[PDB]
Amino acid sequence: MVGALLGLGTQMYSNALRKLPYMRHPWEHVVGMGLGAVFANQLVKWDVKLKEDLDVMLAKARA
Amino acid sequence: LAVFPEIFIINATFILLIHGVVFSTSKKYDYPPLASNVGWLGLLSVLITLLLLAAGAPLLTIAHLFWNNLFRRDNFTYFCQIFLLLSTAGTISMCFDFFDQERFDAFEFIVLILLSTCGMLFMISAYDLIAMYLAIELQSLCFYVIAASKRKSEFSTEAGLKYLILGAFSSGILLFGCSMIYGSTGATHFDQLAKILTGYEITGARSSGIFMGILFIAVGFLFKITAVPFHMWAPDIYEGSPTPVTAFLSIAPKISIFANILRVFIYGSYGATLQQIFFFCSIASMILGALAAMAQTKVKRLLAYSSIGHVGYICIGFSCGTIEGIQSLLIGIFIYALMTMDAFAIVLALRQTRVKYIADLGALAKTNPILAITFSITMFSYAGIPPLAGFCSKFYLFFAALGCGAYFLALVGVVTSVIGCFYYIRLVKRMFFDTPRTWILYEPMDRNKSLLLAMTSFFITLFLLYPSPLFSVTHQMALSL
Amino acid sequence: DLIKYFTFSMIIFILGIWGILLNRRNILIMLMSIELMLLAVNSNFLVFSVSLDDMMGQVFALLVLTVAAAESAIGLAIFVITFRV
Amino acid sequence: ILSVLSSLALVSGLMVVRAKNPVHSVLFFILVFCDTSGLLLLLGLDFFAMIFLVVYIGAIAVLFLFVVMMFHIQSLRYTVYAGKVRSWTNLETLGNLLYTYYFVWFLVPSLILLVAMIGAIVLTMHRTTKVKRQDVFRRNAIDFRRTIM
Amino acid sequence: NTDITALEKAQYPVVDRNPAFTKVVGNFSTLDYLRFSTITGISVTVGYLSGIKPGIKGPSMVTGGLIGLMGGFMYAYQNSAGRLMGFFPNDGEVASYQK
Amino acid sequence: GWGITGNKGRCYDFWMDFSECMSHCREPKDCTLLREDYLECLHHSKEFQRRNRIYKEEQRKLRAASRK
Amino acid sequence: EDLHTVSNWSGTHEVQTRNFNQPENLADLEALVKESHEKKLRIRPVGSGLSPNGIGLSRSGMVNLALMDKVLEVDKEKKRVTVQAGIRVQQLVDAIKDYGLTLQNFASIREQQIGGIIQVGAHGTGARLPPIDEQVISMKLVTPAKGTIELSREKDPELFHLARCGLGGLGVVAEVTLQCVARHELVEHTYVSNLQEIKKNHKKLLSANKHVKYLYIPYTDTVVVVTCNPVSKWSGPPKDKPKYTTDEAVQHVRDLYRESIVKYRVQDSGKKSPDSSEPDIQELSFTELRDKLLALDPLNDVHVAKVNQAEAEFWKKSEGYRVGWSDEILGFDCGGQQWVSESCFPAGTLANPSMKDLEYIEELKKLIEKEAIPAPAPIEQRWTARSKSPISPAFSTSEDDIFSWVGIIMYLPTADPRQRKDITDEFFHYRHLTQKQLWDQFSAYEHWAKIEIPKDKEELEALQARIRKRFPVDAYNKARRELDPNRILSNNMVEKLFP
Amino acid sequence: AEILGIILPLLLGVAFLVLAERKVMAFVQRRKGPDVVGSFGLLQPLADGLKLILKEPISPSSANFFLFRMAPVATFMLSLVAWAVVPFDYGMVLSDLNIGLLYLFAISSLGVYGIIIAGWSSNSKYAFLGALRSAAQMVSYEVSIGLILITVLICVGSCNLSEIVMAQKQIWFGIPLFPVLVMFFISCLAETNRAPFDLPEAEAELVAGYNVEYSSMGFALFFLGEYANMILMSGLCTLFFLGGWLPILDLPIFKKIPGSIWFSIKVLFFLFLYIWVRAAFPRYRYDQLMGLGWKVFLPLSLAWVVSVSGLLVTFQWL
């Protein structure tokens, strides 16, 4: 997913401070970040479901 | 049940505390440097706490006995409590390198950080004045000790004494307010307090005793968050202590206090006095910070003043009563925290350099050019330049402020952002365009510190492409109160 | 008579904050005034618990006792460390 | 007449904030606590009077005395005879609450006393035990041993 | 007095309100015993790995395992309780409909 | 609402009325009658203000007689 | 409609008034109904308990009606108010009055929810005035598991009648639509007349207004009688450009349910004529007298008989008549609840030649006088029309008929409480005013709100079988099982009535 | 008032305790103690006194009269005021405080002041550090006495000393909690100095360990204070653990059962135990002593509060 692409970039330019060149065996951890993007989108559907409920719960409590 | 996430961190602290003392006092192990072994184990203790708190989020409100007489856990607290642990863990991640370079045999220093997190976790969920004060006392008391950790150097200990007195006064002032608030209410619970104080309006309905308490409770909180009305020696605390301890107090206590502030004041108190004082503080903090960023020279002090300026932008959200504004404050706290961790980490990246001025920090264009771009991103995020995540948070704060009608407060924030931007372009000019100051060559850091920059700097730039999740998360928390 | 036992505590607290403001030079008097104002709020809790005929005041007063005492312990220990060797 | 003699506490509190001689400051500190305990006696809160005595002028102002001596600075009532049949001493009616109903505000001061212990240890161990009494520490192989001065 | 009555409660069908210990722990699904087992591993592995530096690999591994036992067990307990009570997915109602 | 001698405290009964009447109360303004009664039990201010005027009117007659 | 303010800037401060228990979201309430339909747990709408019959059970799950009360919709063009059953009748009538329309008949007590009243044999005073049960054009019943199905009187006349007569046992009405009549003005009359004289004058009152209400107080020859007359449109002065001054004689603003709180101002202002009916009180002296009447039962209280005559004289001293809109002017039962149990004689068209309207009133009043145990609270006697097919369109055809409603009221709260409740229940069961001993042949229709054949412990057979013998509720009993197989909407008194 | 009837007999008790200690601790050493002055040395205390009174000062020094001429007065007044709440027989306590025990704890917490002040006014670094060490010892065996009293308090209902001695009608708390009596005695030995635990009271280091300006009155008042504090802390091992004024309850025909006489007999037993245990045991060195109050009598006192609380909670004996 887009998140895996993000975890390749984040693994690179990291250790660039250490001037370590290019990438190494732990660097290819974009499968783990790919999981983060999937969860972040999934959290938003649940968050949006809850966000609609937060407005409706406020109205039910308001009465 | 219902206190298990807090119970685990307290148990984890005790288990680490017993492990550190028995091991450190061991001839067989040659009195080894436990810190950094307590670390990693300390970072996973926070992570296990983070999972337990998240796992039981529906189960958190298990019984009336805990909420009514001790502490009440709610959906807003859970989202911020998750952030509080993540902020604490992120600070530990950069701090591990400092432990390695320093002769840190202070295993207890990690236990204090975990104890502080437990106090902070109890602070976010505290629903009684007694509980909030006791929790604030523990989190600050753990923090007071971390400030005085380097006993051989008086600079840390003297900075600790000013932090200690400011902390003691802030807790004491808040305590006196609780006494006065208790005298009128007859109960110490925020829930019972809200029923007595709902719509009190010291102008509309007479409430002399309650207001006397409210004045003290509000003042005490401001000292804790380094608000400019009570900034006092708090900026001095940031520069005097070494950068890593400074980072821990810079974000985690402040986030805990801000979350505690929304719960104690908006729900419990309803008078036209609380919003205005934050409005004055917000204008002053941003004005003080903008003047200070130009006035201050040391990179560490400048960060504290830039953080104080950002704190004023955060204060505006409480100042405007709209729930959208409270949400905007939450967007700001998250962005400020990510940048504050990122900013401290970039300073921590130049571990080799001893205390040095911005001009010495310049000349990073030729050496570590990518880090130089990374430093530019950190300054831009507080500056409010539009592409960065901070501006999007500020624009939501400003858009909410314009909707709230705070044109005067909003304008000074834009003006302070303008005042800050000029120094930041000058600092960006200092990094590459001019004032190299000797072509100094820097040193590497740990991967965790580079990742703290990597996961944050990419995200700060990536905020523009996908800014929807953070905005959604922030409003849900504000509505929950 | 509650006012007599409260405004006296109130002005003991004012004495504490006053000594805080003046004595920013000397710290032992600073800690003296800290425990002073943590008494004037503690005695305040006790007076307000006798007046309101409510026990939450005394529970909170006991906990403030055993919290201000730990605060004085750490305060004076920090003060002794501040006068290094 | 002892009711209004809280003026003694009042003036002794003004002494501690307006005294350059620290012995007088700590003496009038102890005096403030003694008169505050007198007050807490007049209110009938007997437990809190003795607790003020103990944990203030037998511990805390003991601390402060140490910091001075060393480290010198240089008719119509209607008594309702119900609820009097079983008079609850102040300790009993603090224990009926603090340990069962508001017990978490009692386990949190437990943690605050534990943090005070850890703090007095990590602060004022003063390099007098394993904090630095581990050893001077030495390594032979790296050591120059007269190769480098 | 005490009562297990909860806020936001019974979002799923309750199986046994207020489960007794030694039952809510005898309800550990092969996922809970797999959560209590991975937490104890990530806590022993970190505990041993943290202690490679100070020479305390064994005892730091043991204390990391103690932390992991406490934490992973309280997590498996959270799960099996919010399952027995009406808080979690709670597909283990067959255990009640069968017994 | 426990008290110095316990016995249910004194103003818990007033708080019980204020809280019962704060169930799904329309607004605090609507139930403020119980809150003021509850505050009055807590500080006795309503009795005191009346006591001051009863003292003042009695004192005013006595002061007027004394001044003559 | 909105709530009564939120200080927290959010729902955390809650206002609901009646039904403080709290009601879930309508979808959430339906999910709770589905959960019970799948848990088999009895669920009833929250019940005020003013009615002796237990429509709402504390043991059963209770559904908050505050949102239903808050949301009200009235259509002026269709002359129909579409509102949930939760809204109280007083709020509903006020909304209809705001829309310029009036309700032909009214419930005895403003506090009870209109939907619950429709379930409990809804009826209003008037021989020519159709009952509220026939005045409701449409109803929506909760579908046992999830969702509801909209229904109308024309679409399902028998089913609508079965549900209304079921007391809500057959189904719970999620939303009820009531036809609204053109606005008319009712003048309230409060006076005290001899029971024998009033029974003789009953035909004259029925001819004069067509609506008759009689309150009987024991130990007093004179019994307070309250009547309402509908004035003609533009009666006396014709309507003109000034909206209120010209029409003030035809229509005037009047207090409705003004005495919400029993305590009232004792100060004397304006007319300052004290009465216990239209105002709670107008004078300090008559307030002390009213307290004595409440404390002492009429048999031992000499003053109450004198007070009843005095209040009638005070009404003559005060304005001769009070004219107000039909929604504005109506009879309201007092907030305090006192148990009422009795059966109502039916004045059927075939029965009208056999027993005269004067004969019906005389026999019932004589029986109340003959009662072995007197009931201290006044006994209300009222007349309602049959559920005529013309009033609300229905496939079913109903012959025109009249009903006479008598309810015997005794003081529920008393010294040694419930001892009187036991003797009065025995008195209702076997004395001259007996539900089954002598009225079984009469087949008098018990009011649904009243308890049936009290005490229910003394006889449960009558509710299960004798009621089925008295009226054809056998189809309703089969329908009750058919409408809800799970019987989640189950009330114990409805279970006795319909198995 | 009747405070004379509790201070004068206590003054005579202390004056005769100096002789009782010398004489008992001498009998232990196979030698008669003071035996010529009075018929049996009974006048020897009066001789010691009347000598100390007639001894000319070494230097008048009446100038410094508010600093350390009232500090021995304070120590002695505290040692004497902790005698109010001590009940000698049913209804013979001078002032039955319903929090009596906690008041004794507070009186000890003020005796700490007495020692610290009377040592600081002695401008002798060695003597002042000795007084500070003695105060730290007296206050380190006060957490252990505190927890021991929490044990005997759990057994009793309330802190009322008359109740703590009335709660032993069935059995003295010396029989079930004997291990606790041994810890209270070994703490009262160490709270006061007169004990195997008296390195600050090592024969020489004591005299040069309390003050510089003796004038005799200071020497007598400290010793009168130590011996009253000893009579008191022995009148506590006999209220709490032994039956305050209770007989064995056999109800003899020969014994008419006076109360105060039984309290006297028991406090004599504990005073004789003070003496006997001073004779027969070597001193603890104040470096093993402080490591005995923390590492030995605090864990073994905490355990006892949990043991006597547990065993009384499980079986409802509370």
Short mmCIF file of N, CA, C and O in Angstrom, two decimals, chain B residues 10 14 17 20-21 24-25 30-32 65-66 69-71 105 107-108 111-112 115 118 122 128 130-131 134-135 137-138 141-142 145 148 151-152 188-189, chain D residues 100-116 118-137 139:
data_model
loop_
_atom_site.label_atom_id
_atom_site.label_comp_id
_atom_site.label_asym_id
_atom_site.label_seq_id
_atom_site.Cartn_x
_atom_site.Cartn_y
_atom_site.Cartn_z
N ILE B 10 2.65 0.75 37.49
CA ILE B 10 3.13 0.83 38.90
C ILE B 10 3.84 -0.48 39.26
O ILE B 10 4.94 -0.40 39.82
N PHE B 14 7.80 -1.02 40.05
CA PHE B 14 8.31 -1.70 41.27
C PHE B 14 9.24 -2.82 40.84
O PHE B 14 10.33 -2.96 41.41
N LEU B 17 12.32 -1.37 39.68
CA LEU B 17 13.04 -0.74 40.82
C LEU B 17 13.76 -1.82 41.63
O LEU B 17 14.95 -1.65 41.91
N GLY B 20 16.58 -3.17 39.48
CA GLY B 20 17.75 -2.28 39.38
C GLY B 20 18.55 -2.27 40.67
O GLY B 20 19.76 -2.48 40.60
N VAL B 21 17.88 -2.14 41.82
CA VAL B 21 18.64 -2.01 43.09
C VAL B 21 19.38 -3.32 43.40
O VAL B 21 20.58 -3.24 43.71
N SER B 24 22.15 -3.61 40.77
CA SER B 24 23.19 -2.55 40.86
C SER B 24 24.00 -2.80 42.12
O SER B 24 25.24 -2.69 42.06
N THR B 25 23.34 -3.16 43.21
CA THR B 25 24.09 -3.52 44.43
C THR B 25 24.49 -4.99 44.33
O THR B 25 24.08 -5.76 45.22
N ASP B 30 29.43 -7.00 39.48
CA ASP B 30 30.39 -5.86 39.51
C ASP B 30 29.64 -4.52 39.49
O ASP B 30 30.09 -3.61 38.76
N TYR B 31 28.52 -4.42 40.22
CA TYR B 31 27.82 -3.11 40.33
C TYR B 31 27.62 -2.53 38.92
O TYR B 31 28.11 -1.42 38.66
N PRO B 32 26.91 -3.22 38.01
CA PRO B 32 26.82 -2.79 36.61
C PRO B 32 25.95 -1.55 36.33
O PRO B 32 25.16 -1.19 37.18
N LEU B 65 -17.67 2.44 41.59
CA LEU B 65 -16.81 2.72 42.77
C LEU B 65 -15.57 3.50 42.33
O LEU B 65 -15.26 4.52 42.97
N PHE B 66 -14.91 3.06 41.26
CA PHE B 66 -13.72 3.79 40.76
C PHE B 66 -14.08 5.16 40.21
O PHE B 66 -13.45 6.14 40.63
N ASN B 69 -15.79 7.73 43.21
CA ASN B 69 -15.02 8.16 44.41
C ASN B 69 -13.52 8.22 44.14
O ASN B 69 -12.81 8.62 45.06
N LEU B 70 -13.05 7.82 42.97
CA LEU B 70 -11.57 7.80 42.82
C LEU B 70 -11.12 8.45 41.51
O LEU B 70 -10.58 9.57 41.58
N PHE B 71 -11.31 7.78 40.37
CA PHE B 71 -10.97 8.39 39.06
C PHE B 71 -11.93 7.88 37.99
O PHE B 71 -12.22 6.67 38.00
N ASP B 105 24.45 5.29 35.93
CA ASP B 105 24.21 4.10 36.77
C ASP B 105 22.87 4.36 37.44
O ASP B 105 22.49 3.58 38.33
N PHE B 107 19.72 3.72 37.58
CA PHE B 107 18.61 2.82 37.18
C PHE B 107 17.33 3.50 37.66
O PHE B 107 16.34 3.49 36.92
N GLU B 108 17.39 4.15 38.83
CA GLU B 108 16.18 4.78 39.41
C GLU B 108 15.67 5.86 38.46
O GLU B 108 14.47 6.14 38.51
N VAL B 111 13.01 4.49 36.47
CA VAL B 111 11.82 4.15 37.29
C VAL B 111 11.06 5.44 37.55
O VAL B 111 9.82 5.42 37.49
N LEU B 112 11.77 6.55 37.76
CA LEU B 112 11.12 7.86 37.98
C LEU B 112 10.30 8.23 36.73
O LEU B 112 9.16 8.67 36.90
N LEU B 115 7.28 6.06 36.76
CA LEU B 115 6.41 6.53 37.86
C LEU B 115 5.73 7.82 37.41
O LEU B 115 4.53 7.96 37.67
N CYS B 118 2.95 6.94 35.21
CA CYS B 118 1.81 6.43 36.01
C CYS B 118 1.09 7.61 36.67
O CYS B 118 -0.15 7.62 36.64
N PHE B 122 -2.71 8.60 35.73
CA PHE B 122 -3.72 8.90 36.77
C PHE B 122 -4.21 10.34 36.63
O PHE B 122 -5.38 10.60 36.92
N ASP B 128 -11.33 13.75 40.57
CA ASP B 128 -11.58 14.43 41.86
C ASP B 128 -10.43 15.40 42.12
O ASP B 128 -9.32 15.14 41.63
N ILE B 130 -8.87 16.01 44.78
CA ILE B 130 -7.85 15.31 45.60
C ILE B 130 -7.06 14.43 44.64
O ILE B 130 -5.82 14.54 44.64
N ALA B 131 -7.75 13.70 43.78
CA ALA B 131 -7.05 12.76 42.87
C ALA B 131 -6.16 13.55 41.92
O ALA B 131 -4.99 13.16 41.75
N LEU B 134 -3.13 14.94 43.82
CA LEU B 134 -2.20 13.86 44.25
C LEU B 134 -1.47 13.35 43.01
O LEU B 134 -0.24 13.19 43.08
N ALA B 135 -2.19 13.15 41.91
CA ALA B 135 -1.56 12.66 40.67
C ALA B 135 -0.57 13.70 40.14
O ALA B 135 0.54 13.31 39.74
N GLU B 137 1.01 15.83 41.89
CA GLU B 137 2.17 15.86 42.81
C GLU B 137 3.15 14.75 42.42
O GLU B 137 4.34 15.06 42.28
N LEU B 138 2.64 13.54 42.17
CA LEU B 138 3.53 12.40 41.84
C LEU B 138 4.26 12.68 40.53
O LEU B 138 5.48 12.49 40.49
N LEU B 141 6.78 15.35 41.15
CA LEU B 141 7.84 14.91 42.11
C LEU B 141 8.84 14.02 41.37
O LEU B 141 10.05 14.24 41.54
N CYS B 142 8.34 13.13 40.51
CA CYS B 142 9.27 12.30 39.71
C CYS B 142 10.09 13.24 38.83
O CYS B 142 11.32 13.07 38.77
N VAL B 145 13.03 15.11 40.59
CA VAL B 145 14.25 14.28 40.79
C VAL B 145 15.04 14.19 39.48
O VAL B 145 16.27 14.32 39.55
N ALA B 148 17.47 17.06 38.93
CA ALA B 148 18.67 17.13 39.80
C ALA B 148 19.54 15.88 39.65
O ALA B 148 20.40 15.67 40.52
N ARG B 151 24.20 15.29 39.98
CA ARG B 151 24.55 15.96 41.26
C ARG B 151 25.94 16.60 41.22
O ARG B 151 26.12 17.65 41.86
N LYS B 152 26.91 15.96 40.54
CA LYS B 152 28.30 16.49 40.53
C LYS B 152 28.28 17.90 39.91
O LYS B 152 28.99 18.77 40.44
N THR B 188 -15.47 16.99 46.85
CA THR B 188 -14.21 17.24 46.11
C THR B 188 -14.29 16.68 44.69
O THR B 188 -13.38 16.96 43.90
N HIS B 189 -15.34 15.91 44.37
CA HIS B 189 -15.41 15.26 43.03
C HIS B 189 -15.70 16.30 41.95
O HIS B 189 -16.52 17.19 42.21
N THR D 100 -11.32 1.96 53.00
CA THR D 100 -12.29 1.14 52.28
C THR D 100 -13.01 1.88 51.17
O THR D 100 -13.26 1.30 50.12
N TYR D 101 -13.37 3.15 51.37
CA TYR D 101 -14.18 3.85 50.38
C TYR D 101 -13.34 4.75 49.49
O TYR D 101 -13.47 4.70 48.26
N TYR D 102 -12.47 5.56 50.08
CA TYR D 102 -11.55 6.41 49.33
C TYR D 102 -10.14 5.83 49.37
O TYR D 102 -9.16 6.55 49.47
N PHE D 103 -10.05 4.50 49.28
CA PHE D 103 -8.78 3.83 49.50
C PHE D 103 -7.76 4.11 48.40
O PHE D 103 -6.57 3.93 48.64
N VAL D 104 -8.18 4.54 47.22
CA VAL D 104 -7.17 4.84 46.21
C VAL D 104 -6.50 6.18 46.50
O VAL D 104 -5.31 6.35 46.24
N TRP D 105 -7.22 7.12 47.09
CA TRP D 105 -6.52 8.30 47.59
C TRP D 105 -5.74 8.02 48.76
O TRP D 105 -5.29 8.95 49.40
N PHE D 106 -5.62 6.76 49.15
CA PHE D 106 -4.74 6.37 50.24
C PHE D 106 -3.60 5.50 49.76
O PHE D 106 -2.53 5.52 50.37
N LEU D 107 -3.81 4.76 48.68
CA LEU D 107 -2.73 4.06 47.99
C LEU D 107 -1.92 4.98 47.10
O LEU D 107 -0.82 4.60 46.70
N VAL D 108 -2.43 6.15 46.75
CA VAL D 108 -1.64 7.12 45.99
C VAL D 108 -0.70 7.87 46.92
O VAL D 108 0.46 8.09 46.56
N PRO D 109 -1.12 8.31 48.12
CA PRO D 109 -0.12 8.78 49.09
C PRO D 109 0.85 7.70 49.49
O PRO D 109 1.97 8.00 49.89
N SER D 110 0.46 6.43 49.38
CA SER D 110 1.43 5.36 49.50
C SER D 110 2.52 5.51 48.45
O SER D 110 3.72 5.44 48.76
N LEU D 111 2.12 5.72 47.20
CA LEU D 111 3.10 5.92 46.14
C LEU D 111 3.88 7.21 46.34
O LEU D 111 5.04 7.29 45.93
N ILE D 112 3.29 8.21 46.98
CA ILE D 112 4.02 9.45 47.20
C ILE D 112 5.05 9.28 48.30
O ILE D 112 6.15 9.82 48.21
N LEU D 113 4.73 8.50 49.32
CA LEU D 113 5.75 8.18 50.32
C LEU D 113 6.83 7.29 49.74
O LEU D 113 8.01 7.43 50.09
N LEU D 114 6.47 6.38 48.83
CA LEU D 114 7.49 5.58 48.17
C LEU D 114 8.39 6.44 47.28
O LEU D 114 9.60 6.23 47.23
N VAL D 115 7.80 7.41 46.59
CA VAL D 115 8.60 8.32 45.77
C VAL D 115 9.46 9.21 46.66
O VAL D 115 10.57 9.58 46.28
N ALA D 116 8.98 9.54 47.86
CA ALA D 116 9.81 10.30 48.78
C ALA D 116 10.98 9.47 49.27
O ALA D 116 12.09 9.99 49.43
N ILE D 118 12.42 6.90 47.55
CA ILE D 118 13.31 6.80 46.40
C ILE D 118 14.03 8.12 46.18
O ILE D 118 15.20 8.15 45.79
N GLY D 119 13.36 9.24 46.45
CA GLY D 119 13.97 10.53 46.20
C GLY D 119 15.04 10.86 47.23
O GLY D 119 16.14 11.29 46.88
N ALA D 120 14.72 10.68 48.51
CA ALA D 120 15.73 10.90 49.53
C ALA D 120 16.91 9.96 49.36
O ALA D 120 18.02 10.28 49.79
N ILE D 121 16.70 8.81 48.73
CA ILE D 121 17.81 7.91 48.48
C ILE D 121 18.65 8.39 47.31
O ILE D 121 19.87 8.54 47.43
N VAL D 122 18.02 8.64 46.16
CA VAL D 122 18.79 8.97 44.97
C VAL D 122 19.43 10.35 45.11
O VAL D 122 20.48 10.61 44.51
N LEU D 123 18.84 11.23 45.91
CA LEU D 123 19.40 12.56 46.09
C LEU D 123 20.51 12.55 47.13
O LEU D 123 21.67 12.85 46.82
N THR D 124 20.18 12.19 48.36
CA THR D 124 21.11 12.31 49.48
C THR D 124 21.79 10.99 49.82
O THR D 124 22.08 10.73 50.99
N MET D 125 22.06 10.13 48.84
CA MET D 125 23.01 9.07 49.11
C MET D 125 24.42 9.61 49.09
O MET D 125 25.31 9.06 49.75
N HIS D 126 24.65 10.68 48.33
CA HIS D 126 25.86 11.49 48.41
C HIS D 126 27.11 10.69 48.07
O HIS D 126 28.18 10.90 48.65
N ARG D 127 26.98 9.77 47.11
CA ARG D 127 28.09 8.94 46.66
C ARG D 127 28.72 8.16 47.81
O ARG D 127 29.92 7.89 47.80
N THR D 128 27.91 7.79 48.80
CA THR D 128 28.40 7.10 49.99
C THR D 128 28.10 5.61 50.00
O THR D 128 28.39 4.94 50.99
N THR D 129 27.53 5.07 48.93
CA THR D 129 27.25 3.64 48.82
C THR D 129 27.39 3.27 47.35
O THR D 129 28.05 3.98 46.58
N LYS D 130 26.78 2.14 46.94
CA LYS D 130 26.97 1.60 45.60
C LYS D 130 26.75 2.62 44.50
O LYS D 130 27.11 2.35 43.34
N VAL D 131 26.14 3.76 44.81
CA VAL D 131 26.03 4.85 43.84
C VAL D 131 27.40 5.21 43.29
O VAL D 131 27.57 5.40 42.08
N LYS D 132 28.41 5.30 44.16
CA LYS D 132 29.80 5.39 43.72
C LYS D 132 30.77 4.52 44.51
O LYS D 132 31.93 4.42 44.10
N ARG D 133 30.36 3.90 45.62
CA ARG D 133 31.24 3.02 46.36
C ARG D 133 31.45 1.67 45.68
O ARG D 133 31.99 0.75 46.30
N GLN D 134 31.01 1.54 44.43
CA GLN D 134 31.28 0.33 43.66
C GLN D 134 32.78 0.05 43.59
O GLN D 134 33.25 -0.98 44.08
N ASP D 135 33.54 0.98 43.03
CA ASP D 135 35.00 0.94 42.96
C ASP D 135 35.45 2.20 42.23
O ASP D 135 34.65 2.87 41.56
N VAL D 136 36.73 2.52 42.37
CA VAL D 136 37.35 3.52 41.50
C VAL D 136 37.29 3.06 40.05
O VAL D 136 37.34 3.90 39.14
N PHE D 137 37.35 1.74 39.80
CA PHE D 137 37.31 1.16 38.42
C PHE D 137 38.63 1.36 37.66
O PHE D 137 39.07 2.51 37.51
N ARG D 139 41.18 -0.47 34.16
CA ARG D 139 41.39 -1.53 33.13
C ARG D 139 42.86 -1.56 32.69
O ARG D 139 43.33 -0.52 32.19
#
